[PDB]
Amino acid sequence: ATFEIVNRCSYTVWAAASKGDAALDAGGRQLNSGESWTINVEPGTKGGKIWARTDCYFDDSGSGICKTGDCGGLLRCKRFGRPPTTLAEFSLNQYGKDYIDISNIKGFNVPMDFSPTTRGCRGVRCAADIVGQCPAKLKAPGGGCNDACTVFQTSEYCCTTGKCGPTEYSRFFKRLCPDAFSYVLDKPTTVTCPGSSNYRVTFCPTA
Template sequence: MFSSVLFSFTHAATFEIVNQCSYTVWAGAVPGGGQQLNQGQSWTINVNPGTTQARIWPRTNCNFDGNGQGKCETGDCGGLLQCQGYGSPPNTLAEYALNQFNNMDFLDISLVDGFNVPMDFSPTTGGCRGIRCSADINGQCPTELKAPGGCNNPCTVFKTDEYCCNSWTCGPTTYSKFFKDRCPDAYSYPKDDPTSTFTCPSGTNYKVVFCP
Protein backbone atom coordinates (compact mmCIF):
# COMPACT_ATOMS: atom_id res chain seq x y z
CA MET A 1 0.00 0.00 0.00
CA PHE A 2 2.64 2.52 1.08
CA SER A 3 4.86 1.97 -1.95
CA SER A 4 2.03 2.56 -4.43
CA VAL A 5 1.08 5.81 -2.70
CA LEU A 6 4.71 6.91 -2.80
CA PHE A 7 4.91 6.01 -6.49
CA SER A 8 1.92 8.16 -7.38
CA PHE A 9 3.39 11.16 -5.58
CA THR A 10 6.77 10.63 -7.17
CA HIS A 11 5.64 10.16 -10.74
CA ALA A 12 2.51 12.28 -11.12
CA ALA A 13 3.09 15.00 -13.71
CA THR A 14 2.35 18.68 -13.18
CA PHE A 15 0.94 20.70 -16.07
CA GLU A 16 1.04 24.49 -15.75
CA ILE A 17 -1.33 26.12 -18.26
CA VAL A 18 -0.58 29.79 -18.95
CA ASN A 19 -2.58 32.33 -20.98
CA GLN A 20 -0.29 34.84 -22.66
CA CYS A 21 -2.97 35.89 -25.16
CA SER A 22 -4.30 39.45 -25.10
CA TYR A 23 -7.78 37.97 -24.60
CA THR A 24 -9.44 35.58 -22.16
CA VAL A 25 -9.06 31.87 -22.85
CA TRP A 26 -11.01 29.13 -21.09
CA ALA A 27 -8.67 26.18 -20.76
CA GLY A 28 -10.15 22.71 -21.17
CA ALA A 29 -8.42 19.60 -19.87
CA VAL A 30 -9.23 15.89 -19.80
CA PRO A 31 -8.40 14.92 -17.13
CA GLY A 32 -8.63 18.19 -15.21
CA GLY A 33 -11.87 19.95 -16.12
CA GLY A 34 -11.67 23.61 -17.06
CA GLN A 35 -10.68 27.08 -15.95
CA GLN A 36 -11.16 30.66 -17.13
CA LEU A 37 -7.76 32.29 -17.70
CA ASN A 38 -7.60 36.02 -18.19
CA GLN A 39 -4.46 37.50 -19.76
CA GLY A 40 -1.41 36.47 -17.71
CA GLN A 41 -3.26 33.97 -15.51
CA SER A 42 -2.21 30.34 -15.05
CA TRP A 43 -3.77 27.10 -13.83
CA THR A 44 -1.92 23.99 -12.64
CA ILE A 45 -3.23 20.43 -12.80
CA ASN A 46 -1.66 17.23 -11.48
CA VAL A 47 -2.08 14.13 -13.62
CA ASN A 48 -1.67 10.56 -12.44
CA PRO A 49 1.04 8.32 -13.90
CA GLY A 50 -0.17 5.98 -16.64
CA THR A 51 -2.81 8.44 -17.87
CA THR A 52 -3.46 8.06 -21.62
CA GLN A 53 -5.53 9.84 -24.29
CA ALA A 54 -5.25 13.06 -22.30
CA ARG A 55 -5.45 16.53 -23.80
CA ILE A 56 -5.39 20.23 -22.95
CA TRP A 57 -6.92 22.82 -25.27
CA PRO A 58 -7.98 26.48 -25.44
CA ARG A 59 -11.61 27.56 -25.68
CA THR A 60 -12.56 31.03 -26.89
CA ASN A 61 -15.52 33.41 -26.67
CA CYS A 62 -17.19 31.48 -23.86
CA ASN A 63 -20.13 32.47 -21.71
CA PHE A 64 -20.92 30.49 -18.55
CA ASP A 65 -23.52 31.03 -15.85
CA GLY A 66 -22.99 30.59 -12.12
CA ASN A 67 -23.55 26.85 -12.47
CA GLY A 68 -20.72 26.52 -15.01
CA GLN A 69 -23.08 25.96 -17.93
CA GLY A 70 -22.94 27.85 -21.20
CA LYS A 71 -21.18 27.72 -24.54
CA CYS A 72 -17.88 28.49 -26.30
CA GLU A 73 -17.37 29.56 -29.91
CA THR A 74 -14.39 27.19 -30.25
CA GLY A 75 -13.41 24.13 -28.22
CA ASP A 76 -16.78 23.80 -26.47
CA CYS A 77 -17.06 20.64 -24.36
CA GLY A 78 -20.77 19.94 -24.08
CA GLY A 79 -21.59 23.40 -22.75
CA LEU A 80 -19.69 22.88 -19.47
CA LEU A 81 -16.99 25.02 -17.84
CA GLN A 82 -15.61 21.85 -16.23
CA CYS A 83 -14.98 19.64 -19.25
CA GLN A 84 -15.79 15.95 -18.90
CA GLY A 85 -15.28 15.18 -22.59
CA TYR A 86 -13.19 16.52 -25.45
CA GLY A 87 -13.79 19.88 -27.11
CA SER A 88 -15.47 20.45 -30.45
CA PRO A 89 -13.43 21.60 -33.49
CA PRO A 90 -11.73 23.80 -34.28
CA ASN A 91 -9.30 23.63 -31.36
CA THR A 92 -5.52 23.38 -31.06
CA LEU A 93 -4.68 20.32 -28.95
CA ALA A 94 -1.88 19.44 -26.57
CA GLU A 95 -2.11 15.64 -26.32
CA TYR A 96 -0.17 13.32 -24.04
CA ALA A 97 0.15 9.86 -22.53
CA LEU A 98 2.22 9.42 -19.36
CA ASN A 99 4.61 6.65 -18.34
CA GLN A 100 4.12 4.46 -21.39
CA PHE A 101 6.55 2.30 -23.42
CA ASN A 102 10.08 2.28 -21.91
CA ASN A 103 8.86 4.58 -19.10
CA MET A 104 8.47 7.46 -21.53
CA ASP A 105 5.82 10.16 -21.81
CA PHE A 106 4.48 10.73 -25.34
CA LEU A 107 3.35 14.22 -26.32
CA ASP A 108 2.20 16.12 -29.38
CA ILE A 109 0.45 19.22 -30.60
CA SER A 110 -2.36 18.23 -32.93
CA LEU A 111 -4.17 20.23 -35.61
CA VAL A 112 -6.29 17.20 -36.55
CA ASP A 113 -9.21 19.02 -34.87
CA GLY A 114 -8.21 22.30 -36.50
CA PHE A 115 -6.67 25.40 -34.93
CA ASN A 116 -7.98 28.20 -32.72
CA VAL A 117 -5.15 29.55 -30.52
CA PRO A 118 -1.32 29.42 -30.93
CA MET A 119 0.30 27.04 -28.45
CA ASP A 120 3.58 25.94 -26.92
CA PHE A 121 3.81 22.57 -25.12
CA SER A 122 7.17 22.16 -23.38
CA PRO A 123 8.80 20.24 -20.54
CA THR A 124 9.90 22.24 -17.51
CA THR A 125 12.08 19.33 -16.33
CA GLY A 126 13.47 16.20 -17.96
CA GLY A 127 15.90 17.65 -20.50
CA CYS A 128 13.76 16.92 -23.57
CA ARG A 129 12.55 19.27 -26.29
CA GLY A 130 9.30 21.18 -26.45
CA ILE A 131 6.93 21.71 -29.37
CA ARG A 132 5.25 24.84 -30.66
CA CYS A 133 2.61 25.98 -33.13
CA SER A 134 2.60 29.77 -33.14
CA ALA A 135 1.82 30.65 -36.77
CA ASP A 136 -1.07 32.90 -37.78
CA ILE A 137 -3.14 29.98 -39.04
CA ASN A 138 -6.45 31.73 -38.40
CA GLY A 139 -5.37 34.72 -40.49
CA GLN A 140 -4.07 32.57 -43.37
CA CYS A 141 -6.76 29.86 -43.23
CA PRO A 142 -8.07 28.70 -46.65
CA THR A 143 -11.55 30.11 -47.22
CA GLU A 144 -13.26 26.71 -47.26
CA LEU A 145 -11.75 25.83 -43.85
CA LYS A 146 -12.55 29.11 -42.10
CA ALA A 147 -14.74 28.82 -39.00
CA PRO A 148 -15.88 31.39 -36.44
CA GLY A 149 -12.87 31.88 -34.16
CA GLY A 150 -10.65 29.33 -35.88
CA CYS A 151 -9.54 27.25 -38.85
CA ASN A 152 -11.05 23.80 -39.38
CA ASN A 153 -9.17 20.67 -40.36
CA PRO A 154 -10.47 19.39 -43.73
CA CYS A 155 -11.88 16.22 -42.14
CA THR A 156 -14.33 18.34 -40.14
CA VAL A 157 -15.50 20.11 -43.31
CA PHE A 158 -15.45 17.41 -45.99
CA LYS A 159 -15.74 14.19 -43.89
CA THR A 160 -14.08 12.07 -46.60
CA ASP A 161 -11.62 9.23 -46.13
CA GLU A 162 -8.96 11.23 -47.96
CA TYR A 163 -8.92 13.76 -45.12
CA CYS A 164 -10.19 11.71 -42.16
CA CYS A 165 -7.94 8.66 -42.71
CA ASN A 166 -10.58 6.06 -41.87
CA SER A 167 -8.51 3.57 -43.90
CA TRP A 168 -4.76 2.94 -43.88
CA THR A 169 -4.14 4.38 -47.31
CA CYS A 170 -4.34 8.12 -46.66
CA GLY A 171 -1.40 10.48 -46.95
CA PRO A 172 -0.65 14.20 -46.87
CA THR A 173 -2.99 16.50 -48.79
CA THR A 174 -2.80 20.11 -49.93
CA TYR A 175 -4.69 21.08 -46.79
CA SER A 176 -2.52 19.07 -44.41
CA LYS A 177 0.53 20.68 -46.00
CA PHE A 178 -0.96 24.10 -45.28
CA PHE A 179 -0.87 23.23 -41.56
CA LYS A 180 2.47 21.40 -41.71
CA ASP A 181 4.27 24.24 -43.51
CA ARG A 182 3.27 26.63 -40.73
CA CYS A 183 3.67 24.27 -37.76
CA PRO A 184 6.22 21.56 -38.69
CA ASP A 185 6.09 19.98 -35.20
CA ALA A 186 2.32 19.52 -35.18
CA TYR A 187 0.07 16.72 -36.38
CA SER A 188 -1.45 17.92 -39.65
CA TYR A 189 -3.48 14.78 -40.45
CA PRO A 190 -4.18 11.55 -38.51
CA LYS A 191 -1.26 9.48 -39.88
CA ASP A 192 1.36 12.20 -39.31
CA ASP A 193 3.10 10.28 -36.49
CA PRO A 194 6.74 10.15 -37.65
CA THR A 195 7.33 13.92 -37.47
CA SER A 196 4.82 14.82 -34.80
CA THR A 197 5.20 12.55 -31.74
CA PHE A 198 7.76 13.50 -29.11
CA THR A 199 8.93 11.78 -25.93
CA CYS A 200 10.16 12.80 -22.49
CA PRO A 201 11.23 10.67 -19.51
CA SER A 202 8.41 9.65 -17.19
CA GLY A 203 8.18 12.05 -14.27
CA THR A 204 8.71 15.14 -16.43
CA ASN A 205 6.62 18.23 -15.66
CA TYR A 206 5.17 20.43 -18.41
CA LYS A 207 3.93 23.88 -19.31
CA VAL A 208 1.25 24.64 -21.94
CA VAL A 209 1.27 28.27 -23.09
CA PHE A 210 -1.52 29.85 -25.11
CA CYS A 211 -0.13 32.58 -27.44
CA PRO A 212 3.57 31.90 -26.74
Protein backbone atom coordinates in the same frame (compact mmCIF):
# COMPACT_ATOMS: atom_id res chain seq x y z
CA ALA B 1 2.40 15.02 -12.96
CA THR B 2 2.01 18.79 -12.89
CA PHE B 3 0.89 20.88 -15.84
CA GLU B 4 1.02 24.64 -15.56
CA ILE B 5 -1.33 26.17 -18.15
CA VAL B 6 -0.47 29.78 -18.95
CA ASN B 7 -2.57 32.18 -21.04
CA ARG B 8 -0.14 34.64 -22.72
CA CYS B 9 -2.94 35.76 -25.18
CA SER B 10 -4.28 39.31 -24.94
CA TYR B 11 -7.77 37.79 -24.69
CA THR B 12 -9.43 35.49 -22.09
CA VAL B 13 -9.38 31.76 -22.86
CA TRP B 14 -11.14 28.93 -21.08
CA ALA B 15 -8.57 26.14 -20.61
CA ALA B 16 -9.81 22.56 -20.79
CA ALA B 17 -8.16 19.29 -19.81
CA SER B 18 -9.67 15.88 -20.51
CA LYS B 19 -8.83 12.25 -21.33
CA GLY B 20 -12.06 11.86 -23.39
CA ASP B 21 -14.21 9.90 -20.88
CA ALA B 22 -13.29 12.04 -17.81
CA ALA B 23 -12.02 15.49 -16.80
CA LEU B 24 -8.34 15.85 -15.88
CA ASP B 25 -8.18 17.70 -12.50
CA ALA B 26 -11.06 20.29 -12.53
CA GLY B 27 -11.40 19.85 -16.34
CA GLY B 28 -11.67 23.54 -17.12
CA ARG B 29 -11.12 27.09 -15.93
CA GLN B 30 -11.27 30.65 -17.12
CA LEU B 31 -7.80 32.17 -17.73
CA ASN B 32 -7.62 35.95 -18.12
CA SER B 33 -4.62 37.38 -20.05
CA GLY B 34 -1.46 36.43 -18.06
CA GLU B 35 -3.10 33.95 -15.66
CA SER B 36 -1.58 30.54 -14.89
CA TRP B 37 -3.50 27.47 -13.80
CA THR B 38 -1.68 24.51 -12.28
CA ILE B 39 -3.22 21.05 -12.60
CA ASN B 40 -2.32 17.57 -11.38
CA VAL B 41 -2.55 14.76 -13.92
CA GLU B 42 -2.51 11.21 -12.56
CA PRO B 43 0.57 9.12 -13.56
CA GLY B 44 -0.27 6.59 -16.27
CA THR B 45 -2.78 8.96 -18.01
CA LYS B 46 -3.18 7.81 -21.63
CA GLY B 47 -4.66 10.04 -24.32
CA GLY B 48 -4.79 13.22 -22.25
CA LYS B 49 -5.52 16.50 -24.09
CA ILE B 50 -5.31 20.21 -23.16
CA TRP B 51 -6.80 22.95 -25.35
CA ALA B 52 -8.10 26.53 -25.20
CA ARG B 53 -11.73 27.57 -25.72
CA THR B 54 -12.59 31.08 -26.96
CA ASP B 55 -15.61 33.39 -26.58
CA CYS B 56 -17.31 31.40 -23.83
CA TYR B 57 -20.35 32.20 -21.72
CA PHE B 58 -21.11 30.25 -18.58
CA ASP B 59 -23.78 30.72 -15.93
CA ASP B 60 -23.52 30.30 -12.10
CA SER B 61 -23.73 26.41 -12.54
CA GLY B 62 -20.89 26.09 -15.15
CA SER B 63 -23.16 25.56 -18.19
CA GLY B 64 -22.88 27.54 -21.40
CA ILE B 65 -21.33 27.75 -24.88
CA CYS B 66 -17.88 28.45 -26.47
CA LYS B 67 -17.25 29.47 -30.13
CA THR B 68 -14.25 27.10 -30.26
CA GLY B 69 -13.50 23.93 -28.32
CA ASP B 70 -16.91 23.66 -26.59
CA CYS B 71 -17.12 20.38 -24.62
CA GLY B 72 -20.92 19.87 -24.42
CA GLY B 73 -21.54 23.30 -22.89
CA LEU B 74 -19.62 22.65 -19.65
CA LEU B 75 -17.04 24.93 -17.97
CA ARG B 76 -15.54 21.71 -16.52
CA CYS B 77 -14.81 19.42 -19.52
CA LYS B 78 -15.38 15.65 -19.22
CA ARG B 79 -15.19 15.06 -22.99
CA PHE B 80 -13.11 16.46 -25.88
CA GLY B 81 -13.93 19.85 -27.43
CA ARG B 82 -15.67 20.71 -30.65
CA PRO B 83 -13.18 21.66 -33.49
CA PRO B 84 -11.30 23.90 -34.35
CA THR B 85 -8.93 23.22 -31.42
CA THR B 86 -5.15 23.27 -31.36
CA LEU B 87 -4.35 20.26 -29.12
CA ALA B 88 -1.60 19.55 -26.56
CA GLU B 89 -1.62 15.73 -26.43
CA PHE B 90 0.04 13.45 -23.96
CA SER B 91 0.42 9.90 -22.72
CA LEU B 92 2.28 9.55 -19.38
CA ASN B 93 4.32 6.65 -17.84
CA GLN B 94 4.04 4.46 -20.96
CA TYR B 95 6.73 1.82 -20.23
CA GLY B 96 8.92 4.37 -18.37
CA LYS B 97 8.47 7.28 -20.81
CA ASP B 98 6.11 10.22 -21.44
CA TYR B 99 4.98 11.13 -24.99
CA ILE B 100 3.91 14.63 -25.98
CA ASP B 101 2.80 16.40 -29.17
CA ILE B 102 0.83 19.27 -30.63
CA SER B 103 -1.82 18.32 -33.21
CA ASN B 104 -3.71 20.34 -35.88
CA ILE B 105 -5.77 17.21 -36.78
CA LYS B 106 -8.83 18.81 -35.19
CA GLY B 107 -7.99 22.24 -36.62
CA PHE B 108 -6.44 25.32 -34.99
CA ASN B 109 -7.85 28.03 -32.78
CA VAL B 110 -5.07 29.40 -30.53
CA PRO B 111 -1.23 29.28 -30.95
CA MET B 112 0.46 27.07 -28.39
CA ASP B 113 3.76 25.94 -26.87
CA PHE B 114 3.93 22.57 -25.06
CA SER B 115 7.19 22.12 -23.16
CA PRO B 116 8.58 20.06 -20.25
CA THR B 117 9.48 22.09 -17.11
CA THR B 118 11.78 19.21 -15.99
CA ARG B 119 14.97 17.84 -17.71
CA GLY B 120 15.38 15.23 -20.51
CA CYS B 121 13.52 16.49 -23.67
CA ARG B 122 12.66 19.57 -25.81
CA GLY B 123 9.27 21.27 -26.26
CA VAL B 124 6.95 21.59 -29.29
CA ARG B 125 5.29 24.69 -30.66
CA CYS B 126 2.71 25.85 -33.21
CA ALA B 127 2.68 29.65 -33.05
CA ALA B 128 2.09 30.73 -36.67
CA ASP B 129 -0.94 32.85 -37.64
CA ILE B 130 -2.93 29.84 -38.95
CA VAL B 131 -6.28 31.67 -38.44
CA GLY B 132 -5.09 34.72 -40.46
CA GLN B 133 -3.69 32.57 -43.31
CA CYS B 134 -6.50 29.90 -43.19
CA PRO B 135 -7.71 28.72 -46.67
CA ALA B 136 -11.20 30.18 -47.40
CA LYS B 137 -12.98 26.77 -47.24
CA LEU B 138 -11.51 25.85 -43.83
CA LYS B 139 -12.39 29.18 -42.11
CA ALA B 140 -14.70 28.59 -39.16
CA PRO B 141 -17.35 31.40 -38.76
CA GLY B 142 -17.12 31.15 -34.94
CA GLY B 143 -13.35 31.65 -35.21
CA GLY B 144 -10.39 29.40 -35.97
CA CYS B 145 -9.24 27.21 -38.86
CA ASN B 146 -10.97 23.85 -39.32
CA ASP B 147 -9.18 20.68 -40.39
CA ALA B 148 -10.42 19.20 -43.75
CA CYS B 149 -11.95 16.07 -42.08
CA THR B 150 -14.34 18.25 -39.98
CA VAL B 151 -15.37 20.33 -43.04
CA PHE B 152 -15.61 17.68 -45.79
CA GLN B 153 -16.13 14.32 -43.99
CA THR B 154 -14.31 12.22 -46.65
CA SER B 155 -12.41 8.97 -46.14
CA GLU B 156 -9.28 10.74 -47.52
CA TYR B 157 -9.33 13.66 -45.03
CA CYS B 158 -10.53 11.55 -42.06
CA CYS B 159 -8.16 8.63 -42.90
CA THR B 160 -11.13 6.32 -42.31
CA THR B 161 -9.46 3.20 -43.89
CA GLY B 162 -6.00 4.02 -42.48
CA LYS B 163 -4.97 4.58 -46.15
CA CYS B 164 -4.77 8.34 -46.70
CA GLY B 165 -2.03 10.68 -47.91
CA PRO B 166 -1.21 14.36 -47.31
CA THR B 167 -3.63 16.79 -48.98
CA GLU B 168 -3.68 20.44 -50.11
CA TYR B 169 -5.38 21.21 -46.74
CA SER B 170 -3.02 19.15 -44.54
CA ARG B 171 0.02 20.72 -46.34
CA PHE B 172 -1.19 24.19 -45.32
CA PHE B 173 -1.14 23.22 -41.56
CA LYS B 174 2.23 21.48 -42.05
CA ARG B 175 3.72 24.52 -43.85
CA LEU B 176 2.78 26.95 -41.03
CA CYS B 177 3.47 24.42 -38.23
CA PRO B 178 5.90 21.65 -39.25
CA ASP B 179 6.19 20.52 -35.61
CA ALA B 180 2.46 19.67 -35.27
CA PHE B 181 0.52 16.67 -36.73
CA SER B 182 -1.27 17.96 -39.88
CA TYR B 183 -3.22 14.72 -40.66
CA VAL B 184 -3.80 11.26 -39.07
CA LEU B 185 -0.91 9.52 -40.86
CA ASP B 186 1.49 12.48 -40.74
CA LYS B 187 5.19 11.59 -40.03
CA PRO B 188 5.12 11.62 -36.12
CA THR B 189 6.26 14.84 -34.38
CA THR B 190 5.85 13.12 -30.96
CA VAL B 191 8.54 14.02 -28.41
CA THR B 192 9.73 11.34 -25.96
CA CYS B 193 10.25 12.64 -22.40
CA PRO B 194 11.44 10.85 -19.18
CA GLY B 195 8.55 9.15 -17.38
CA SER B 196 6.96 11.46 -14.74
CA SER B 197 8.08 14.76 -16.35
CA ASN B 198 6.20 18.05 -15.54
CA TYR B 199 5.04 20.47 -18.22
CA ARG B 200 3.86 23.89 -19.17
CA VAL B 201 1.23 24.63 -21.86
CA THR B 202 1.44 28.28 -22.98
CA PHE B 203 -1.34 29.81 -25.10
CA CYS B 204 0.00 32.55 -27.52
CA PRO B 205 3.69 31.84 -26.60
CA THR B 206 4.92 34.64 -28.94
CA ALA B 207 2.22 37.42 -28.94
